Amino acid sequence: VDELLKGELVPENLTEDQKKKKKEIMEQESLWKNPDFKGYNKTFQELHQLSKTFANNQFRLALSNYQSGVNTIMKNRDWVEQYRKEEAEKKRLDEKWYWQKVDRKAREERVVYREKMKAKQDALNYFSKAINHLDEIKNPDLRERPEFKRLLSDVYRSWIMAEYDLQNLPQTIPILELYIEIDDNEKEYPAHKYLASAYSFEENMIKKTKGPDDMLFKYRYKKNVHLLRATELKYGKDSPEYKHIVNVINRDEVISV
């Protein structure tokens, strides 16, 4: 089942009394129809943010931004694939020595690396906008629907992957922790694999800058927990990989005998 097939958050249209109640409100607003009205006090007008119309409108804005960021990554890979194909298929009439071939290859790598970093930053901008649109949906009931969770995981997953490619490891930690709190996302080993690297980066920075010992241990403890969890999720418990990790964790961690 595809949760984003219809491109909507909650379908809005049953009680006879409720239909009667809605009818009189419609007539009341007809009497006071004033498109030029602007409420001095915004408290009443801000109640619209809890409506289904606001959530549906915000959902498509976040959906559109998510799609735009996805296109940026996909087109970048397609262009890079095409670029190497065209570079290899063109003739080199002045290329006869091996060190010339090495130098040409390094030029291609710089071009490819340059465009990948440029694409990642553009895609992250769309994902960051997609995050902001979803964070202003203040209705708790609409936040638990499968459609909301489907997009929120996809937005977080793409954002974390792109932010990791930009070497922004510390900024990936808060999104990853919110990621594993949705449905059964905690059971996915890739989500725990990144947290292993993300906390390892934090641990090195505290050690490199000679930071507080309390922060050093908290990051070191968090690093092993998600590193061990990923080993269990991908290779299984009591596996040879699991046994190897425990020895590494135990040697690194502090134990009392």
Place this chain on the structure above:
Amino acid sequence: VDELLKGELVPENLTEDQKKKKKEIMEQESLWKNPDFKGYNKTFQELHQLSKTFANNQFRLALSNYQSGVNTIMKNRDWVEQYRKEEAEKKRLDEKWYWQKVDRKAREERVVYREKMKAKQDALNYFSKAINHLDEIKNPDLRERPEFKRLLSDVYRSWIMAEYDLQNLPQTIPILELYIEIDDNEKEYPAHKYLASAYSFEENMIKKTKGPDDMLFKYRYKKNVHLLRATELKYGKDSPEYKHIVNVINRDEVISV
């Protein structure tokens, strides 16, 4: 019986009158409930240092540091054992001379000695922190409990053992003397063995630097006293070993006939 099994100093929870006194104070503190209060005069809040909550909190901090220091020492021996195992099992395709094997061996000894001292220094910092935590437990009654004496000896013993390895012998004298004043640690021959070496170091320094003669004798006398006591505690009085030490000490000391 393990005094550190529960990891606490004194278990905190009976008289009807006392239960009434505790009731009225709790009511009074509710009236003046103000989490932002900060006492301008520190004398009254400093009385919290005599509480059981403070002593338990300090005891657990010292316990945490003691465990970390022992982990530092123990993990190092695990690494040293593993390092020697890995070195012997790797292939040496470019080693054919006896002096080459001697040369390769000496590097491993230098690597091992370098890492051991780093572990000893790292563990010593944990023990010195553990020592400081216990010193600010100001309640004499809580200092006589078996749990406190159990941890105090263990912290002192590890700190003394580590500091001797860093060749800082004169620093072990004050800690060793406080060690043999707790329970029946005075009957341990290792305690008096260390004091014999430590006071010998002090005797040489006075002799070498040509210090006062009075300090030369005092370090010499203290050296002999603990040297003889260690011999007695291990091999027994009127033993062949004990007779050997008495001949040495009498020859070394100055006597009048």
